[PDB]
């Protein structure tokens, strides 16, 4: 089963550079064709590059000029991306992908040339947030959402976790590490005129659970290398 | 090259729903057509004009000729609402091409009123002299509410912040509100209240101190 997974810094300045890796497992970078896309908040995609996995061979969205590059690593099985001198038209979701390529003969003398053509994309990443800015990044506080009495007094009550603060996008939660994933929901953050996001994520539990079964919410910030699981005391 | 989409169309659960995508002579590339359910990533549907990729349902057909390629979803259904995109390889220049993209909404579509969760402040935070009230809006449609906050019932301003609503994986939308408050002003009033408009009705959720 082929996954894909984007990674790499969340923040970058603008005029510098954005580096981005896709650690590819359950088949080798050398078997396939990669490609990168995008999507600003909001809009559609749009193509970036893409790369012959043992080939090197490489093609460019014209429109982005001199400034990508693509390559391959075989020894840790990944491929990578950089966009140089970004602005804030480079914010945006960053996905890595498999293209679907096949060759065609065609018999010279000589001989045979090849030719390619390519088909969908597939075993998409789950895309990476990148956010060109100036602003500083900030690790979340975390803070408890408590039922209330009257709440509890019902059959079912939602508890959650508040994360306040952060910069930039985004933030993941689970609950008690992720073996909890009936009645979650996480709400998309808010933008504060402070500058800083935050977010709220809330599990939906019977109320005989409160206060005999223990509720932890997982909250991951890459940006900021933030990881804090959050006792929810009841 | 170009490519061209309109950027909605809806249709009546059963009904059959029509993307098209359009390009000079689009019917000599291989058409391919991605849905996406943002934020989830794109999902490959048909490839080579009309080769379904696996676990994509026979009611998902594709075809291609002149200038347009059609994605065609028969019987639709709740399931099926979501951005399709199409997209081409063109060869001579080595560029791929995605059109921009046509938001699916499956009609009626019953009015759902918004379920409210309020939260106070945690003791955590109030000790570092904050007080962040939380309101929680669920499960509505249409995507659309007015949310405003009192205090011992005069109208609160501000400090208040609001959402976009946000589509849901059941189709149903999501919004929140914060009331951004310091320790002494939360403990200044005796009640707070979160009132949610949608579709003529409200919905209202109190706390207190």
């Known amino acids: 089963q082929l996954q894909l997974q984007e990674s790499g810094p969340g923040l970058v300045k603008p005029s510098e550079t954005l580096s981005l890796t896709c650690a590819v497992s359950?088949?080798?970078?050398?078997?396939?064709?990669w490609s990168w896309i995008r999507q600003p908040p909001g809009k559609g995609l749009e193509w970036i590059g893409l790369?012959?996995?043992?080939?090197?061979?490489?093609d460019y969205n014209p429109s982005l000029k001199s400034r990508v590059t693509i390559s391959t690593d075989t020894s840790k099985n990944q491929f990578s991306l950089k966009l140089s001198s970004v602005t804030a038209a480079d914010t945006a979701v960053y996905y890595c992908?498999?293209?679907?390529?096949?060759?065609?003969?065609?018999?010279?003398?000589?001989?045979?040339?090849?030719?390619?053509?390519?088909?969908?994309?597939?075993?998409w990443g789950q895309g990476v947030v990148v956010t060109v800015s100036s602003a500083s990044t900030k690790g979340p506080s975390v803070f408890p959402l408590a039922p209330s009495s009257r709440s509890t007094s019902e059959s079912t009550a939602a508890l959650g976790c508040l994360v306040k603060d952060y910069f930039p996008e985004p933030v993941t939660v689970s609950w008690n590490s992720g073996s909890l994933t009936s009645g979650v929901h996480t709400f998309p953050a808010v933008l504060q005129s402070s500058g800083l996001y935050s977010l709220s994520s809330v599990v939906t539990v019977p109320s005989s659970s409160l206060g005999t079964q223990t509720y932890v919410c997982n909250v991951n910030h890459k940006p900021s290398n933030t990881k804090v699981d959050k006792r929810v005391e009841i | 090259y170009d490519l061209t989409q309109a950027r909605s169309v809806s249709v009546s659960p059963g009904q059959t729903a029509r993307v098209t995508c359009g390009g000079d002579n689009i019917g000599s590339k291989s058409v391919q057509w991605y849905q996406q359910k943002p934020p989830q990533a794109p999902v490959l549907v048909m490839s080579?004009?009309?080769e379904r990729s696996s676990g994509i349902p026979e009611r998902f057909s594709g075809s291609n000729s002149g200038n347009t390629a059609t994605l065609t979803i028969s019987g639709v259904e709740a399931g099926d609402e979501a951005d399709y995109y199409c997209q081409v390889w063109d060869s001579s220049s080595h560029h791929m091409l995605f059109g921009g993209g046509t938001r699916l909404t499956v009609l009626g579509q019953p009015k759902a009123a918004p379920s409210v969760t309020l939260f106070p402040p945690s003791s955590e935070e109030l000790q570092a002299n904050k007080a962040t009230l939380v309101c929680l809006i669920s499960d509505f449609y249409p995507g659309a509410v007015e949310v405003a906050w009192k205090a011992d019932g005069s109208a609160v301003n501000a400090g208040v912040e609001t959402t976009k609503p946000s589509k849901q994986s059941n189709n149903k939308y999501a919004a929140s509100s914060y009331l951004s408050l310091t320790s002494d002003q939360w403990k200044s009033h005796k009640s707070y209240s979160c009132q949610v408009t949608h579709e003529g009705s409200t919905v209202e959720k109190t706390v207190a101190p």
């Open positions: 992908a498999r293209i679907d390529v096949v060759i065609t003969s065609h018999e010279d003398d000589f001989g045979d040339y090849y030719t390619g053509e390519y088909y969908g994309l597939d075993s």
């Open positions: 359950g088949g080798s970078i050398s078997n396939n064709h």
């Open positions: 080579a004009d009309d």
């Open positions: 790369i012959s996995g043992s080939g090197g061979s490489t």
